[PDB]
Design a protein around this ligand. Structure first.
Ligand SMILES: [Zn+2]
Ligand SMILES: [Zn+2]
Ligand SMILES: [Zn+2]
Ligand SMILES: [Zn+2]
Ligand SMILES: [Zn+2]
Ligand SMILES: [Zn+2]
Ligand SMILES: [Zn+2]
Lengths: 67, 295, 47, 142, 149
RNA sequence: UCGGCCUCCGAACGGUAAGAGCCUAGCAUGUAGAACUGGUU
C-alpha cells in the first residue's frame, strides 16, 4: 500500500503549505533541531549540559557521579 | 506487576440540563484520551461544547466512572436528579459511603468499582441508589426548578480587572467586577466538592434549609388539633379526610371558611404529627395550599 | 570575537587520590594520580 | 529591494507600478519586524495576510477593475510573488469578492468542518457582538 | 464549492512564526513546547527531504514547496526532485568542463574552512542577512549561439 | 626475446558508592463552583 505521509499531514489542520527559498528552509530545519534538542535536555533537567550551535554536547561544570 | 487502571473510553456524556444549554441542536466535540480525570486521575474521553450563545465552552472534568459512581454531572459536579451538591444529598440520605484519599488506594478502589460496574448492567449508581428510594425529606424544598444559566457565564477578564483589556467589547470574557476574595465561599476545592467535605456552598444551603421549619409543627400542648390555613372554601373536609386516611384513623376533620382553616386531629400522636408535617406548607388539595400551625 | 575550542570533556583524575592522597588500585589506577585544585578549560571559558 | 528570481528583463509597464509595491513591501517588512510582545499569539500574524491581501488587490485593481496593465506583466507579477494566484481565482467567483484569506474558507481547518464566521453575511449574524476573525482579523468579509 | 483544496499562503507567515518562539524561552509559547518535542519522530524524514533537494551548481536560487507545522515545529520540503536524464547528464558534463578549466586557470584555489561558523556564533536570520542581497554567479558554461542553438 | 591479484581502520558500559530531607530551580493547570426573605382557636 502506498500510504503517503505528507498528504496525510496536509489533510489535517495542523499543517500548512507555502513556497520558500531552500536556504531559508535549511536554516529553519537547523534552528528547529537545535531548539528541540535543547528542549529535550531541559525536559530531562540536565541544565549542567549545553548544546553548542554546531551540535557539540558539552558539560558546563565538573560532574558528580549522579550527574 | 500487571495491575493498572484501565482507560475509560465511551461516548454519550452524562450531563445536567443546565450545563447542556437550551438549544436542541448542539455541535459537539470529542477527544478519545484528551485529559485526565480530576478525581481518579485516569485518562478519559473528553467532551467539549458551547452550551449557548455567550457561554464559556464548558467541557467534562471528571471521568464517567466517578460520575456514574456518585450520580453527578461530569462538569457541574451536582446531582442529576436534584441539582444539589453531593454533601447536601449525603447529609439528606447517607454519609457512611466514603472514599479513600491516598492515590494508590483511590486508584485501587476506582478500579474495583469500575470492574464491578462493568460486571453489572452498565448504568447503575451502585446500591446507593437503593438507599436513595426515600426522598422529599427537605431537599425538594430548596431544589431549583429553572435552569440556572448564570453558571455558564464566561470568566472575568483579568486584563479588565487591571484595566488593560485592549479588546474592549471584542473580549469574550466578562468586563465586570469579581466577587469578594475575603469571602470564604470563594475557596471551592474540587476534591472537597466531590467528597462532600467542608464545602461552603453546602454549608450555606444547609443553614438556609435549617431555617425553614417546613416539618417542625408541634405548637400545641399535647393537642392533636392543628389548623391548616390557606384552604378556604376551595378545599373541603373530603380532601382532609382523604389526606388523613393515609395516616390511619382521624379523630376529627373539619373545614371552616370563616377563618379559612382546616382543623385536623388524629387519635394517634404519630399520625397527627405526620399529618401536621405533610400539611406544613407542602400540601395542595383541590387547588388550595395548606400551611399547618396551631389552632 | 568568538574563540570556541572543542575540548575533550572527560577529566580523568582519580577522585580517591585527589582528596585523600591514597588510591586502592595503586599502580593499576585507570585515571591519573594528581592532587591539585586548578580550574579546567571549560570552567575558565564559562567564567 | 526584492531579489528577482527571473533574472531577465522586466516588462514594459513595470516602472510606473514598481514603487507602490515596493513601499507595500516595506510595510511587509514592518510586519516582519514588529515585536510580538503585548498583542496575542494569533494577533501578530493578523497584519501580514491583510498586507498581502492589499498587495493582491492592487494587482487586481490593475487588471480587471481598470484593465490598465498587460497580461504578461500580470503573469510576471504572479510569478514574482507579488500576487496570489489562488486568491485572485477565488476573487473571480460570485460570492467571494472581498475574501480576507484563502485559509479562512478552508473547511479542513475548523473543528466542525465549516467556514469561518466572517464569511457569514452581516444580516444573518443573529448573535450580536463585535466579530473579529482569529485567522486573519476579518470583520465580516462577505 | 463542493470542496476547496489547501492553497499556499505567503512565506512571511512561516517567517514570522519562526521569528517568534525564539529558543522556546518565552512563557507565551509554553503550550507548543510538547509539540516541539514531537519532531524527534519526524526530523530524519525532514533531513532526507531537505538534503535531496539541494540546489545544483548552475542554480543560484531554488524555490521549493514547503509543508510546515502551524506552530513552526517542523518544515518538510514537500517535493521530489525530478530531472530529465540527458539534460542532467549534459549539465553535469558542462560542470565538469568548467571545473577542469577553473582548476587549470586559477592560481591559488582556497578551501573554505570547516565549520564556516563558530560554535557560539548564532544562526543568521534569513531576512536580516540573505533576503536583501544579490546572489553571486553560478558556474554556467557559456554555449555557442550557432552550434548549441 | 611473454602479467595483472594489496584485509585492517571506533565508540558506550565496564571505577571514581548508595540513601536522606530541608528553602531553592525547572515543569504541569489556564480548571468545576458562588442558590441566600411570606399562612387563621
Ligand atoms: Zn452539569
Ligand atoms: Zn474518575
Ligand atoms: Zn476583557
Ligand atoms: Zn587512583
Ligand atoms: Zn479569513
Ligand atoms: Zn474568518
Ligand atoms: Zn473574512
Amino acid at each position: 500500500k502506498k500510504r503517503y505521509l505528507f498528504r496525510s499531514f496536509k489533510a489535517t489542520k495542523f499543517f500548512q503549505s507555502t513556497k520558500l527559498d531552500w536556504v531559508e528552509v535549511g536554516l529553519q530545519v537547523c534552528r528547529q533541531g537545535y531548539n528541540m534538542l535543547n528542549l529535550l535536555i531541559h525536559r530531562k533537567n540536565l541544565n549542567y549540559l549545553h548544546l553548542d550551535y554546531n551540535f557539540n554536547l558539552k558539560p558546563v561544570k565538573t560532574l558528580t557521579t549522579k550527574e | 506487576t500487571y495491575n493498572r487502571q484501565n482507560w475509560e473510553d465511551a461516548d454519550f456524556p452524562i450531563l445536567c440540563q443546565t450545563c447542556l444549554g437550551e438549544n436542541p441542536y448542539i455541535r459537539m466535540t470529542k477527544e478519545k484520551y484528551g485529559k485526565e480525570c480530576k478525581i481518579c486521575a485516569r485518562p478519559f474521553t473528553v467532551f467539549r461544547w458551547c452550551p449557548g450563545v455567550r457561554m464559556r465552552f464548558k467541557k467534562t472534568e471528571v471521568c464517567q466512572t466517578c460520575s456514574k459512581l456518585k450520580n453527578v454531572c461530569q462538569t457541574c459536579l451536582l446531582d442529576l436528579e436534584y441539582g444539589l451538591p453531593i454533601q447536601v444529598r449525603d447529609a439528606g440520605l447517607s454519609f457512611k459511603d466514603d472514599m479513600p484519599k491516598s492515590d494508590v488506594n483511590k486508584e485501587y478502589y476506582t478500579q474495583n468499582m469500575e470492574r464491578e460496574i462493568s460486571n453489572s448492567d452498565g448504568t447503575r449508581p451502585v446500591g446507593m441508589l437503593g438507599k436513595a428510594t426515600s426522598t422529599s425529606d427537605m431537599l425538594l424544598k430548596l431544589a431549583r426548578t429553572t435552569p440556572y444559566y448564570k453558571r455558564n457565564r464566561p470568566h472575568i477578564c483579568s486584563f479588565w480587572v487591571k484595566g488593560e483589556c485592549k479588546r474592549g467589547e471584542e473580549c469574550p470574557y466578562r468586563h465586570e467586577k469579581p466577587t469578594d476574595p475575603d469571602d470564604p465561599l470563594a475557596d471551592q476545592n474540587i476534591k472537597d466538592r466531590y467528597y462532600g467535605i467542608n464545602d461552603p456552598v453546602a454549608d450555606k444551603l444547609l443553614k438556609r434549609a435549617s431555617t425553614m421549619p417546613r416539618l417542625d409543627p408541634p405548637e400545641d400542648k399535647t393537642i392533636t388539633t392543628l389548623y391548616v390555613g390557606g384552604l378556604g372554601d376551595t378545599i373541603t373536609e373530603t380532601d382532609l379526610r382523604n389526606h388523613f386516611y393515609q395516616f390511619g384513623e382521624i379523630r376529627t376533620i373539619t373545614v371552616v371558611q370563616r377563618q379559612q382553616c382546616a382543623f385536623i386531629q388524629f387519635a394517634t400522636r404519630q399520625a397527627a404529627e405526620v399529618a401536621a408535617e405533610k400539611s406544613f406548607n407542602k400540601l395542595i388539595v383541590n387547588g388550595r395550599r395548606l400551611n399547618v400551625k396551631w389552632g | 570575537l568568538r574563540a570556541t575550542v572543542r575540548w575533550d570533556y572527560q577529566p580523568d583524575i582519580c577522585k580517591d587520590y585527589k582528596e585523600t592522597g591514597f588510591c586502592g588500585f595503586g599502580d593499576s589506577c585507570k585515571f591519573l594520580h594528581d592532587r591539585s585544585d586548578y580550574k579546567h578549560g571549560w570552567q575558565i571559558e564559562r567564567e | 529591494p526584492k531579489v528577482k528570481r527571473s533574472r531577465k528583463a522586466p516588462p514594459d509597464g513595470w516602472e510606473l507600478i514598481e514603487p507602490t509595491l515596493d513601499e507595500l513591501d516595506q510595510k511587509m517588512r514592518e510586519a516582519e519586524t514588529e515585536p510580538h510582545e503585548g498583542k496575542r499569539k494569533v494577533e501578530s500574524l493578523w497584519p501580514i495576510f491583510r498586507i498581502h491581501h492589499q498587495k493582491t488587490r492592487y494587482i487586481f485593481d490593475l487588471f480587471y477593475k481598470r484593465k490598465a496593465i498587460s497580461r504578461e506583466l500580470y503573469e510576471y507579477c504572479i510569478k514574482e510573488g507579488y500576487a496570489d494566484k489562488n486568491l485572485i481565482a477565488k476573487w473571480k467567483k460570485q460570492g467571494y469578492e472581498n475574501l480576507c484569506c484563502l485559509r479562512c474558507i478552508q473547511t479542513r481547518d475548523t473543528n466542525f468542518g465549516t467556514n469561518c464566521i466572517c464569511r457569514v453575511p452581516k444580516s444573518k449574524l443573529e448573535v450580536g457582538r463585535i466579530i473579529e476573525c482569529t485567522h486573519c482579523g476579518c470583520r465580516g468579509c462577505s | 464549492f463542493v470542496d476547496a483544496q489547501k492553497e499556499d499562503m505567503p512565506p512571511e507567515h512561516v517567517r514570522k512564526i519562526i521569528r517568534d518562539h525564539g529558543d522556546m524561552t518565552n512563557r507565551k509559547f509554553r503550550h507548543d513546547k510538547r509539540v516541539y518535542l514531537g519532531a524527534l519522530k519526524y526530523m530524519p524524514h525532514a533531513v532526507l527531504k531537505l538534503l535531496e533537494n539541494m540546489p545544483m551548481p548552475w542554480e543560484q536560487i531554488r524555490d521549493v514547496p514547503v509543508l510546515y507545522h502551524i506552530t513552526g515545529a517542523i518544515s518538510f520540503v514537500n517535493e521530489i526532485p525530478w530531472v530529465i536524464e540527458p539534460v542532467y547528464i549534459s549539465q553535469w558534463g558542462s560542470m565538469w568542463i568548467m571545473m577542469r578549466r577553473e582548476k587549470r586557470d586559477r592560481r591559488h584555489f582556497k578551501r573554505m574552512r570547516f565549520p564556516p561558523f563558530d560554535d557560539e556564533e548564532p544562526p543568521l536570520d534569513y531576512a536580516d542577512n540573505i533576503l536583501d542581497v544579490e546572489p553571486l554567479e553560478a558556474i554556467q558554461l557559456e554555449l555557442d549561439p550557432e552550434e548549441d542553438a
